């Protein structure tokens, strides 16, 4: 709801040497998720924009 600081960017403990650089950041959610760290129907980065479970649930 709020985002002092910069905290917006965060996942899953995944990250090691991993995919990132691929990681979904929602509208303006503090749900930034990679696609495979959701049950992924999604991997391909989507160029537009994308919403977090919470959003897609609800909107
Ligand atoms: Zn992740
Ligand atoms: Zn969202």
Redo the contacts with the bound molecule.
Sequence with gaps: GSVNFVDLYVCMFCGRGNNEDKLLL??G?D?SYHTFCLIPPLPDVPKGDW??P??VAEE
């Design positions: 929602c509208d959610c749900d919403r977090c919470k959003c």
